[PDB]
PDB file of C-alpha atoms in Angstrom:
ATOM      1  CA  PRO A  27     -55.668  68.430  34.293  1.00 54.15           C
ATOM      2  CA  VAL A  28     -58.709  66.503  35.346  1.00 53.17           C
ATOM      3  CA  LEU A  29     -60.163  63.064  35.377  1.00 52.50           C
ATOM      4  CA  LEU A  30     -63.777  62.329  34.621  1.00 51.31           C
ATOM      5  CA  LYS A  31     -64.840  59.214  36.673  1.00 51.83           C
ATOM      6  CA  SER A  32     -68.369  57.486  36.746  1.00 51.47           C
ATOM      7  CA  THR A  33     -68.580  57.194  40.573  1.00 55.49           C
ATOM      8  CA  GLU A  34     -71.067  54.203  39.849  1.00 53.18           C
ATOM      9  CA  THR A  35     -69.075  51.680  37.970  1.00 51.37           C
ATOM     10  CA  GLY A  36     -65.653  53.088  39.153  1.00 47.01           C
ATOM     11  CA  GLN A  37     -64.612  53.689  35.618  1.00 48.10           C
ATOM     12  CA  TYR A  38     -62.812  56.690  34.075  1.00 49.75           C
ATOM     13  CA  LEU A  39     -63.529  58.290  30.697  1.00 50.05           C
ATOM     14  CA  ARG A  40     -60.932  57.639  27.913  1.00 52.04           C
ATOM     15  CA  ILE A  41     -60.261  59.008  24.556  1.00 53.14           C
ATOM     16  CA  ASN A  42     -58.185  56.421  22.469  1.00 53.52           C
ATOM     17  CA  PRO A  43     -56.060  57.690  19.763  1.00 52.06           C
ATOM     18  CA  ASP A  44     -58.017  56.229  16.892  1.00 53.50           C
ATOM     19  CA  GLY A  45     -60.877  58.639  18.036  1.00 53.67           C
ATOM     20  CA  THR A  46     -62.970  56.005  19.944  1.00 56.99           C
ATOM     21  CA  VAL A  47     -64.299  56.564  23.265  1.00 55.08           C
ATOM     22  CA  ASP A  48     -64.689  54.188  26.360  1.00 54.25           C
ATOM     23  CA  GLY A  49     -64.465  53.615  29.977  1.00 54.46           C
ATOM     24  CA  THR A  50     -61.704  51.914  31.833  1.00 54.15           C
ATOM     25  CA  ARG A  51     -60.686  51.122  35.515  1.00 55.76           C
ATOM     26  CA  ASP A  52     -57.255  51.497  34.609  1.00 58.60           C
ATOM     27  CA  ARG A  53     -56.097  54.767  36.528  1.00 56.51           C
ATOM     28  CA  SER A  54     -52.476  54.551  35.102  1.00 57.87           C
ATOM     29  CA  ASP A  55     -53.809  55.416  31.525  1.00 56.62           C
ATOM     30  CA  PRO A  56     -52.485  58.880  30.166  1.00 54.04           C
ATOM     31  CA  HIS A  57     -55.611  58.772  27.843  1.00 58.34           C
ATOM     32  CA  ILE A  58     -58.112  59.387  30.640  1.00 52.89           C
ATOM     33  CA  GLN A  59     -56.304  62.651  31.191  1.00 55.61           C
ATOM     34  CA  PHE A  60     -58.701  65.883  30.378  1.00 57.63           C
ATOM     35  CA  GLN A  61     -58.632  69.642  30.355  1.00 62.89           C
ATOM     36  CA  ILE A  62     -61.842  71.696  30.575  1.00 64.20           C
ATOM     37  CA  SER A  63     -61.558  74.738  28.413  1.00 66.55           C
ATOM     38  CA  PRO A  64     -64.056  77.700  29.090  1.00 67.78           C
ATOM     39  CA  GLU A  65     -66.184  79.340  26.294  1.00 70.70           C
ATOM     40  CA  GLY A  66     -67.089  82.667  27.868  1.00 71.79           C
ATOM     41  CA  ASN A  67     -70.931  81.715  27.528  1.00 72.20           C
ATOM     42  CA  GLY A  68     -70.487  79.314  30.699  1.00 75.16           C
ATOM     43  CA  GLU A  69     -70.126  76.259  28.471  1.00 78.08           C
ATOM     44  CA  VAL A  70     -66.771  74.338  28.168  1.00 76.72           C
ATOM     45  CA  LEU A  71     -64.934  72.000  26.000  1.00 75.04           C
ATOM     46  CA  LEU A  72     -63.524  68.469  26.903  1.00 71.91           C
ATOM     47  CA  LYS A  73     -60.291  67.740  25.366  1.00 70.83           C
ATOM     48  CA  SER A  74     -57.660  64.979  25.886  1.00 71.02           C
ATOM     49  CA  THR A  75     -54.240  66.178  27.018  1.00 71.32           C
ATOM     50  CA  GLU A  76     -52.714  63.254  25.112  1.00 71.42           C
ATOM     51  CA  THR A  77     -54.345  62.768  21.733  1.00 73.30           C
ATOM     52  CA  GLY A  78     -55.376  66.407  21.786  1.00 68.46           C
ATOM     53  CA  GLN A  79     -58.975  65.669  20.236  1.00 67.45           C
ATOM     54  CA  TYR A  80     -62.192  67.244  21.614  1.00 67.86           C
ATOM     55  CA  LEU A  81     -65.117  65.115  22.854  1.00 65.70           C
ATOM     56  CA  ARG A  82     -68.505  65.310  20.921  1.00 65.63           C
ATOM     57  CA  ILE A  83     -71.688  63.527  21.016  1.00 63.75           C
ATOM     58  CA  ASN A  84     -72.922  62.522  17.520  1.00 64.62           C
ATOM     59  CA  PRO A  85     -76.777  63.299  16.910  1.00 69.55           C
ATOM     60  CA  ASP A  86     -77.519  59.639  16.645  1.00 68.03           C
ATOM     61  CA  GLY A  87     -76.319  59.199  20.048  1.00 67.86           C
ATOM     62  CA  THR A  88     -72.811  57.807  19.428  1.00 67.56           C
ATOM     63  CA  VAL A  89     -69.898  59.305  21.046  1.00 69.14           C
ATOM     64  CA  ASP A  90     -66.360  59.837  19.712  1.00 68.53           C
ATOM     65  CA  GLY A  91     -63.618  62.777  19.288  1.00 69.30           C
ATOM     66  CA  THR A  92     -62.476  64.985  16.740  1.00 68.65           C
ATOM     67  CA  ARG A  93     -59.540  67.488  16.776  1.00 70.84           C
ATOM     68  CA  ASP A  94     -61.908  69.913  14.672  1.00 72.87           C
ATOM     69  CA  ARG A  95     -61.724  72.989  17.056  1.00 68.39           C
ATOM     70  CA  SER A  96     -65.052  74.097  15.312  1.00 70.61           C
ATOM     71  CA  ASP A  97     -68.195  71.913  15.911  1.00 69.12           C
ATOM     72  CA  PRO A  98     -70.871  72.690  18.354  1.00 67.22           C
ATOM     73  CA  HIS A  99     -70.951  69.024  19.338  1.00 69.26           C
ATOM     74  CA  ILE A 100     -67.957  69.530  21.659  1.00 65.18           C
ATOM     75  CA  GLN A 101     -70.133  72.181  23.562  1.00 62.24           C
ATOM     76  CA  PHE A 102     -70.763  70.911  27.000  1.00 63.95           C
ATOM     77  CA  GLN A 103     -72.496  72.236  30.088  1.00 65.19           C
ATOM     78  CA  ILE A 104     -71.415  71.117  33.503  1.00 63.66           C
ATOM     79  CA  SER A 105     -74.579  70.636  35.575  1.00 65.79           C
ATOM     80  CA  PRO A 106     -73.998  70.137  39.417  1.00 67.08           C
ATOM     81  CA  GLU A 107     -76.349  67.594  40.909  1.00 70.17           C
TER      82      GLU A 107
ATOM     83  CA  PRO B 218     -92.987  54.988  30.954  1.00 69.99           C
ATOM     84  CA  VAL B 219     -94.109  56.887  34.117  1.00 70.79           C
ATOM     85  CA  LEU B 220     -92.508  58.284  37.249  1.00 69.61           C
ATOM     86  CA  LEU B 221     -94.072  57.825  40.729  1.00 73.16           C
ATOM     87  CA  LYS B 222     -93.264  60.630  43.039  1.00 74.37           C
ATOM     88  CA  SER B 223     -94.627  60.968  46.695  1.00 75.11           C
ATOM     89  CA  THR B 224     -95.758  64.617  46.449  1.00 74.14           C
ATOM     90  CA  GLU B 225     -95.306  64.842  50.152  1.00 72.51           C
ATOM     91  CA  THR B 226     -91.582  64.314  50.431  1.00 71.23           C
ATOM     92  CA  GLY B 227     -91.020  64.777  46.717  1.00 70.26           C
ATOM     93  CA  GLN B 228     -89.337  61.369  46.793  1.00 70.61           C
ATOM     94  CA  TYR B 229     -89.602  59.041  43.766  1.00 68.04           C
ATOM     95  CA  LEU B 230     -90.260  55.145  44.112  1.00 69.99           C
ATOM     96  CA  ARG B 231     -87.417  52.941  43.159  1.00 68.37           C
ATOM     97  CA  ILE B 232     -87.071  49.235  42.654  1.00 63.07           C
ATOM     98  CA  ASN B 233     -83.441  47.938  43.251  1.00 62.68           C
ATOM     99  CA  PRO B 234     -81.965  44.837  41.608  1.00 63.12           C
ATOM    100  CA  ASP B 235     -82.058  42.985  44.871  1.00 61.73           C
ATOM    101  CA  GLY B 236     -85.858  43.365  45.072  1.00 60.04           C
ATOM    102  CA  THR B 237     -85.670  45.902  47.745  1.00 59.79           C
ATOM    103  CA  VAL B 238     -87.779  48.967  47.528  1.00 61.26           C
ATOM    104  CA  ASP B 239     -87.306  52.621  48.553  1.00 64.17           C
ATOM    105  CA  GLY B 240     -87.680  56.516  47.852  1.00 67.21           C
ATOM    106  CA  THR B 241     -85.124  58.875  46.671  1.00 65.36           C
ATOM    107  CA  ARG B 242     -84.815  62.330  45.362  1.00 63.78           C
ATOM    108  CA  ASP B 243     -82.123  61.459  42.886  1.00 62.87           C
ATOM    109  CA  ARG B 244     -84.108  61.655  39.822  1.00 60.18           C
ATOM    110  CA  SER B 245     -81.045  61.060  37.482  1.00 60.64           C
ATOM    111  CA  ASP B 246     -79.352  57.957  36.242  1.00 59.09           C
ATOM    112  CA  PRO B 247     -76.272  57.080  38.227  1.00 58.20           C
ATOM    113  CA  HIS B 248     -74.468  56.185  34.879  1.00 61.35           C
ATOM    114  CA  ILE B 249     -74.572  59.716  33.638  1.00 62.01           C
ATOM    115  CA  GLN B 250     -73.179  61.120  36.834  1.00 61.90           C
ATOM    116  CA  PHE B 251     -69.599  61.953  36.809  1.00 60.10           C
ATOM    117  CA  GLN B 252     -67.112  63.253  39.428  1.00 60.59           C
ATOM    118  CA  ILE B 253     -64.332  65.748  38.569  1.00 64.92           C
ATOM    119  CA  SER B 254     -60.938  65.183  40.115  1.00 65.99           C
ATOM    120  CA  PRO B 255     -58.675  66.388  41.639  1.00 67.76           C
ATOM    121  CA  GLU B 256     -61.459  68.496  43.270  1.00 67.52           C
ATOM    122  CA  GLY B 257     -63.695  66.007  45.274  1.00 69.20           C
ATOM    123  CA  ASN B 258     -67.214  66.650  46.478  1.00 72.04           C
ATOM    124  CA  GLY B 259     -70.245  67.522  44.220  1.00 74.66           C
ATOM    125  CA  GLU B 260     -71.808  65.436  41.404  1.00 74.92           C
ATOM    126  CA  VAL B 261     -72.151  66.715  37.960  1.00 76.95           C
ATOM    127  CA  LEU B 262     -73.927  65.800  34.749  1.00 79.57           C
ATOM    128  CA  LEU B 263     -72.247  66.501  31.300  1.00 78.08           C
ATOM    129  CA  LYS B 264     -74.818  67.382  28.658  1.00 76.87           C
ATOM    130  CA  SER B 265     -73.899  68.318  24.811  1.00 78.55           C
ATOM    131  CA  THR B 266     -75.857  71.637  24.882  1.00 78.79           C
ATOM    132  CA  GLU B 267     -76.003  70.855  21.103  1.00 79.88           C
ATOM    133  CA  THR B 268     -78.105  67.787  20.832  1.00 84.62           C
ATOM    134  CA  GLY B 269     -79.042  68.264  24.430  1.00 84.06           C
ATOM    135  CA  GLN B 270     -77.788  64.684  25.147  1.00 83.63           C
ATOM    136  CA  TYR B 271     -76.193  63.537  28.455  1.00 85.93           C
ATOM    137  CA  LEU B 272     -73.008  61.572  28.645  1.00 83.57           C
ATOM    138  CA  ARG B 273     -73.371  57.972  29.846  1.00 86.08           C
ATOM    139  CA  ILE B 274     -70.883  55.296  30.858  1.00 85.87           C
ATOM    140  CA  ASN B 275     -72.440  51.714  30.744  1.00 88.81           C
ATOM    141  CA  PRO B 276     -71.310  48.817  32.854  1.00 91.05           C
ATOM    142  CA  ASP B 277     -69.815  46.890  29.944  1.00 91.49           C
ATOM    143  CA  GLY B 278     -67.484  49.751  29.539  1.00 91.73           C
ATOM    144  CA  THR B 279     -69.372  51.450  26.453  1.00 91.90           C
ATOM    145  CA  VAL B 280     -70.014  55.101  26.293  1.00 88.30           C
ATOM    146  CA  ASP B 281     -73.032  56.918  24.438  1.00 87.63           C
ATOM    147  CA  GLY B 282     -75.391  59.966  24.821  1.00 89.05           C
ATOM    148  CA  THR B 283     -79.144  60.027  25.724  1.00 92.58           C
ATOM    149  CA  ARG B 284     -81.722  62.544  26.677  1.00 93.51           C
ATOM    150  CA  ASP B 285     -83.098  60.097  29.164  1.00 90.39           C
ATOM    151  CA  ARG B 286     -82.091  61.950  32.189  1.00 93.99           C
ATOM    152  CA  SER B 287     -83.882  59.632  34.763  1.00 96.01           C
ATOM    153  CA  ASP B 288     -82.856  56.542  36.661  1.00 93.45           C
ATOM    154  CA  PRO B 289     -84.368  53.416  34.888  1.00 93.28           C
ATOM    155  CA  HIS B 290     -84.743  51.995  38.397  1.00 96.23           C
ATOM    156  CA  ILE B 291     -87.640  54.612  39.219  1.00 96.98           C
ATOM    157  CA  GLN B 292     -89.560  54.207  35.758  1.00 97.00           C
ATOM    158  CA  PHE B 293     -92.527  52.139  36.063  1.00 94.42           C
ATOM    159  CA  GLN B 294     -95.101  50.927  33.302  1.00 92.48           C
ATOM    160  CA  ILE B 295     -98.869  50.712  34.099  1.00 92.91           C
ATOM    161  CA  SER B 296    -100.464  47.700  32.861  1.00 96.46           C
ATOM    162  CA  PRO B 297    -102.766  47.073  31.022  1.00 96.12           C
ATOM    163  CA  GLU B 298    -102.214  50.412  29.240  1.00 96.62           C
TER     164      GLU B 298
ATOM    165  CA  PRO C  28    -107.040  46.996  38.424  1.00 93.80           C
ATOM    166  CA  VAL C  29    -103.365  47.583  37.329  1.00 96.01           C
ATOM    167  CA  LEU C  30     -99.878  46.174  37.786  1.00 97.53           C
ATOM    168  CA  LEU C  31     -96.894  48.504  38.406  1.00 96.12           C
ATOM    169  CA  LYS C  32     -93.891  46.992  36.866  1.00 95.83           C
ATOM    170  CA  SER C  33     -90.305  48.157  36.851  1.00 94.46           C
ATOM    171  CA  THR C  34     -89.433  47.563  33.256  1.00 93.86           C
ATOM    172  CA  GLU C  35     -85.635  47.710  34.044  1.00 96.30           C
ATOM    173  CA  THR C  36     -85.458  44.689  36.191  1.00 95.25           C
ATOM    174  CA  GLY C  37     -88.749  43.272  35.049  1.00 94.07           C
ATOM    175  CA  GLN C  38     -89.951  43.265  38.671  1.00 94.35           C
ATOM    176  CA  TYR C  39     -93.569  44.084  39.900  1.00 92.83           C
ATOM    177  CA  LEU C  40     -94.303  46.174  43.005  1.00 93.30           C
ATOM    178  CA  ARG C  41     -95.873  44.267  45.859  1.00 96.94           C
ATOM    179  CA  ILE C  42     -97.390  45.043  49.253  1.00 95.32           C
ATOM    180  CA  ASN C  43     -97.115  41.984  51.542  1.00 92.00           C
ATOM    181  CA  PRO C  44     -99.844  41.447  54.251  1.00 90.47           C
ATOM    182  CA  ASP C  45     -97.475  42.540  57.069  1.00 88.97           C
ATOM    183  CA  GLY C  46     -97.096  45.790  55.387  1.00 85.34           C
ATOM    184  CA  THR C  47     -93.638  45.307  53.906  1.00 83.39           C
ATOM    185  CA  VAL C  48     -93.012  46.355  50.310  1.00 84.50           C
ATOM    186  CA  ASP C  49     -90.797  44.609  47.685  1.00 85.01           C
ATOM    187  CA  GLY C  50     -90.433  43.799  44.245  1.00 85.28           C
ATOM    188  CA  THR C  51     -90.938  40.227  42.711  1.00 84.07           C
ATOM    189  CA  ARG C  52     -90.796  38.678  39.072  1.00 82.97           C
ATOM    190  CA  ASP C  53     -93.703  36.404  40.093  1.00 79.94           C
ATOM    191  CA  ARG C  54     -96.749  37.708  38.062  1.00 81.23           C
ATOM    192  CA  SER C  55     -98.974  35.054  39.527  1.00 81.40           C
ATOM    193  CA  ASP C  56     -99.082  36.937  42.819  1.00 81.45           C
ATOM    194  CA  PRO C  57    -102.302  38.801  43.784  1.00 77.57           C
ATOM    195  CA  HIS C  58    -100.266  41.111  46.230  1.00 80.97           C
ATOM    196  CA  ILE C  59     -99.039  42.735  43.063  1.00 84.35           C
ATOM    197  CA  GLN C  60    -102.344  44.143  41.874  1.00 85.20           C
ATOM    198  CA  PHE C  61    -103.162  47.730  42.652  1.00 86.18           C
ATOM    199  CA  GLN C  62    -106.037  50.412  41.981  1.00 86.02           C
ATOM    200  CA  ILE C  63    -105.300  53.974  41.113  1.00 87.68           C
ATOM    201  CA  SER C  64    -107.833  56.103  42.969  1.00 88.71           C
ATOM    202  CA  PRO C  65    -108.186  59.672  41.857  1.00 89.02           C
ATOM    203  CA  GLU C  66    -107.792  62.625  44.527  1.00 90.90           C
ATOM    204  CA  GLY C  67    -109.733  65.540  43.179  1.00 92.46           C
ATOM    205  CA  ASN C  68    -106.678  67.137  42.144  1.00 93.59           C
ATOM    206  CA  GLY C  69    -104.462  65.408  39.610  1.00 94.90           C
ATOM    207  CA  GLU C  70    -102.773  63.076  42.091  1.00 94.83           C
ATOM    208  CA  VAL C  71    -103.833  59.595  42.945  1.00 96.83           C
ATOM    209  CA  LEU C  72    -103.621  56.801  45.615  1.00 94.16           C
ATOM    210  CA  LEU C  73    -101.765  53.479  45.226  1.00 96.02           C
ATOM    211  CA  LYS C  74    -103.890  50.659  46.935  1.00 95.84           C
ATOM    212  CA  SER C  75    -103.496  46.886  46.905  1.00 95.82           C
ATOM    213  CA  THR C  76    -106.692  45.053  45.920  1.00 96.95           C
ATOM    214  CA  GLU C  77    -105.636  42.244  48.346  1.00 98.44           C
ATOM    215  CA  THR C  78    -104.301  43.588  51.485  1.00 97.97           C
ATOM    216  CA  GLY C  79    -106.138  46.854  51.036  1.00 98.13           C
ATOM    217  CA  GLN C  80    -103.162  48.952  52.163  1.00100.99           C
ATOM    218  CA  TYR C  81    -102.179  52.307  50.773  1.00100.44           C
ATOM    219  CA  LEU C  82     -98.632  52.652  49.694  1.00100.70           C
ATOM    220  CA  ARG C  83     -96.358  55.273  51.298  1.00100.57           C
ATOM    221  CA  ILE C  84     -92.948  56.641  51.240  1.00103.95           C
ATOM    222  CA  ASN C  85     -91.562  57.283  54.771  1.00105.27           C
ATOM    223  CA  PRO C  86     -89.541  60.614  55.276  1.00104.38           C
ATOM    224  CA  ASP C  87     -86.446  58.501  56.080  1.00101.83           C
ATOM    225  CA  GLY C  88     -86.735  57.187  52.442  1.00 97.75           C
ATOM    226  CA  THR C  89     -88.197  53.675  53.583  1.00 97.31           C
ATOM    227  CA  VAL C  90     -91.159  52.259  51.921  1.00100.12           C
ATOM    228  CA  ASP C  91     -94.072  50.448  53.429  1.00102.37           C
ATOM    229  CA  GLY C  92     -97.918  50.545  53.573  1.00105.57           C
ATOM    230  CA  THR C  93    -100.653  51.396  55.953  1.00105.56           C
ATOM    231  CA  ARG C  94    -104.425  51.376  55.753  1.00106.15           C
ATOM    232  CA  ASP C  95    -104.655  54.763  57.194  1.00105.67           C
ATOM    233  CA  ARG C  96    -106.823  56.515  54.649  1.00104.39           C
ATOM    234  CA  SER C  97    -105.578  59.681  56.150  1.00105.08           C
ATOM    235  CA  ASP C  98    -101.708  60.329  55.624  1.00103.07           C
ATOM    236  CA  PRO C  99    -100.101  62.697  53.007  1.00101.65           C
ATOM    237  CA  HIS C 100     -97.332  60.011  52.404  1.00103.19           C
ATOM    238  CA  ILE C 101     -99.799  58.078  50.175  1.00103.10           C
ATOM    239  CA  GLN C 102    -100.271  60.927  47.900  1.00104.14           C
ATOM    240  CA  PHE C 103     -98.762  60.355  44.603  1.00105.66           C
ATOM    241  CA  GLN C 104     -98.535  62.264  41.264  1.00107.19           C
ATOM    242  CA  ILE C 105     -98.036  60.396  37.845  1.00109.02           C
ATOM    243  CA  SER C 106     -95.776  61.956  35.334  1.00105.83           C
ATOM    244  CA  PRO C 107     -95.344  60.301  31.913  1.00105.61           C
ATOM    245  CA  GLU C 108     -92.085  59.810  29.950  1.00108.72           C
TER     246      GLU C 108
END
């Protein structure tokens, strides 16, 4: 169970029950709880422990979550910097 | 847009909000840089291998995706061109 | 003769007489005007029309200008987008 924080603003990533995604500085929020699931091909999946939906980036650049286990948009690569 | 790298040190020229100026090898936008906890150390980017977009948290609290991997504070425009 | 503006903040790059470098939103300043001089390769040199100093990035990531025509630190490459 991991948290995804944007060091910059000091904000954590959050997937709300309605499927909307935003950033909060409220560390006492269960919705900022994530789990990184492998894919065998190096890639991973970003899924909320609570809501249980997977994180996707729409083609038009908008971001939300769907519990659809099948959709290459939830495919993510973690690139160390 | 264009980037200005000192081929010598490989550093990029940057203009900060306060008006101060310096160089840095950090080519990427801090708003697309996340830290995974509980693990500490390191700094990672999160790219949707599908659309090739990066995950970004904006100061206002909003979240979206973008292919603009680079820091806007090192992106200059040459006029009149 | 060109201006080097940081679209983001709307600030122009400037080399002050004393050799210090900063960014200003004052477009009516002569110290913000540069000439891009080729370097035989693909590289260029960044030189203020006024002061006549060449822009360099110190190894320590600090930025100032010197009229020393001979110094690899004033070597710059311009990479679009």
